[PDB]
């Protein structure tokens, strides 16, 4: 269970965030995705993935 | 060594034929986990993510065998 839980934070001013999991030793690079933000109702980038 | 430890709740196999549920899409008319020998005949909507067949709107449920390999399909007669 070395895989750990991280949260993807919307780049917009909204505080909305998603949650997922990722391996730390294999891919330490930050994860960047494009997901729907229900507050602004648009697809935006997400960050903050250790 | 070691015994017992048998899985539980094997779900279900057959849920009906002809106008048994009929109304709406239903969620039966399939042997879950089967796929083989129970395919979507086009008349009924395709499988679910767990290989579950279901209806479109209404009608009788029928079973047929056709096509190469002699596979069995479930269709629904729209009414």
């Amino acid at each position: 269970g070395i895989r750990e839980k991280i949260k993807l934070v919307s780049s917009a001013g909204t505080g909305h965030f998603y949650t997922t999991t990722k391996n730390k030793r294999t891919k330490p690079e930050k994860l960047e995705l494009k997901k729907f933000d229900p507050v602004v109702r648009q697809h935006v980038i997400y960050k903050e993935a250790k | 060594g070691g015994s017992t430890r048998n899985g539980r709740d094997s779900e279900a196999k057959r849920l009906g034929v002809k106008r048994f549920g009929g109304e709406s899409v239903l969620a039966g008319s399939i042997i879950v986990r089967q796929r083989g020998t129970k395919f979507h005949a086009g008349a009924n909507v395709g499988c679910g993510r767990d290989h579950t067949l279901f209806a479109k709107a209404d009608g009788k449920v029928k079973f047929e065998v056709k096509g190469p390999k002699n596979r069995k399909f479930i269709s629904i007669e729209a009414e």
Partner: protein, 64 residues
């Protein structure tokens, strides 16, 4: 003396128009990352109490 209500159930159940009771679903407090959004969305609303549990609910809540 008066019957004392179960305060644990008074804040768990609420009475509806036709005598039924509404309650909040379970499994929506923590460890939510591995739960499907469909499941959590279906759990978010409130449901009614089943036939078998109404006897216990009414016994617990005499003044509701």
């Amino acid at each position: 003396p008066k019957i004392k209500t179960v305060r644990g159930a008074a804040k768990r159940f609420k009475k509806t128009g036709k005598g039924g009771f509404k309650h909040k679903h379970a499994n929506l407090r923590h460890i939510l990352t591995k739960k499907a959004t469909k499941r959590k969305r279906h759990l978010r609303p409130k449901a009614m109490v089943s036939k078998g549990d109404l006897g216990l609910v009414i016994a617990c809540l005499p003044y509701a």
